[PDB]
Design a protein around this ligand. Structure first.
Ligand SMILES: Cn1nc(-c2ccc3c(c2)OCO3)cc1N
Ligand SMILES: Cn1nc(-c2ccc3c(c2)OCO3)cc1N
Ligand SMILES: [Cl-]
Ligand SMILES: [Cl-]
Lengths: 139, 133
C-alpha cells in the first residue's frame, strides 16, 4: 500500500491539472499539463514513477489511458492500473496564492508546496511530506 | 545533511535540463526547461521544494539566480543559497534516447533508471536519510 497512488484530473482556467495522491499519506504531486492526452499523461506518470516507488495507480480509466502510449509507459515503469477533497483542498490553496503568481502553473506548485508541508496536528502533527517518507522508509 | 541539494544546468540538443541532486543520497530530480531564465529556474526550484524538504541549494550562482524572481522564490520556499551524476545522466539519456519521441521523455526515463538502480537505490537512500531526519 506504500506503492499505491490515485491520479485524477482537475480543471482551472481552461487548463488541465493532473493530481497524483499518495493514498496512504495524502502527499501530492500535481502539474498543469498542456492537454489531457495519452502522451502528456504517460509523461506525468513516468515522471512520478521516477521519483517515488509507484506500483499501482488508481485512475479514472478515461480516454487518456486507452492508447498505446500510456499503456506502454505503465508497462515500462512497472506500473499496474487498478479524491475531490484533495482536488478542492488543492483548488482552495491555489485560490489563496493565485494573486502572487503570474502563471497558474506557479500557483499550482505553490499550492503543492503548502499542501505537502502543512503540519495540521499542532505540535504533534506530521506533514503529508513527513508521512510519505516515514511510510516508504518503513516499507 | 538531509536538506542539501546541488542544482546544475546541462545542455543536450540545444535544450536546457536542470538537474537537482540530493547530495547525501545521489537521488536526482531533472527536467527539460524552456530556457535558462530566472522565471523557469524559480519554477523548477518551487517544484522541488514542494516535493522534498529543501533547506539549502548549492547553485552555479550564474545569471538565472541574480533576478527578482528566483530570489523571491527561494525566500518564499525558505531556501538559502550557499555534477558527477550529471555526466552519468547523459549516458542514461543516450541509452534510452531511441524509445522516446521527445527528449523530455528520455530525460524522465533516465531519471527513473538512475533513482531505481540498485547496486540500496538512490530512491531508497533519500527516503532513509530523510526519515532518519
Ligand atoms: C522533517 N521532515 N520533512 C519532510 C518532508 C518530506 C517531503 C516533503 C516536505 C517535507 O515538504 C514537501 O515535501 C520529511 C521529514 N522527515
Ligand atoms: C523499497 N524502496 N523503494 C524506494 C524508492 C524511493 C524513491 C524512488 C525509487 C524507489 O525509485 C525512484 O524514486 C524507497 C524504498 N524504501
Ligand atoms: Cl486523467
Ligand atoms: Cl543553472
Amino acid at each position: 500500500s506504500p506503492g499505491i497512488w490515485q491520479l485524477d484530473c482537475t480543471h482551472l482556467e481552461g487548463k488541465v491539472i493532473l493530481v497524483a495522491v499518495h493514498v496512504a499519506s495524502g502527499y501530492i504531486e500535481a502539474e498543469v499539463i498542456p492537454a489531457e492526452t495519452g502522451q502528456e499523461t504517460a509523461y506525468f506518470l513516468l515522471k512520478l514513477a521516477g521519483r517515488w516507488p509507484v506500483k499501482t495507480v488508481h485512475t479514472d480509466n478515461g480516454s487518456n489511458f486507452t492508447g498505446a502510449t500510456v499503456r506502454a509507459a505503465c508497462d515500462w515503469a512497472g506500473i499496474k492500473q487498478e479524491i475531490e477533497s484533495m482536488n478542492k483542498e488543492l483548488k482552495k490553496i491555489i485560490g489563496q496564492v493565485r494573486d502572487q503568481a503570474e502563471h497558474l502553473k506557479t500557483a499550482v506548485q505553490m499550492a503543492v508546496f503548502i499542501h505537502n508541508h502543512k503540519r495540521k496536528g499542532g505540535i504533534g502533527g506530521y506533514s503529508a511530506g513527513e508521512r510519505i517518507v516515514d511510510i516508504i522508509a518503513t516499507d
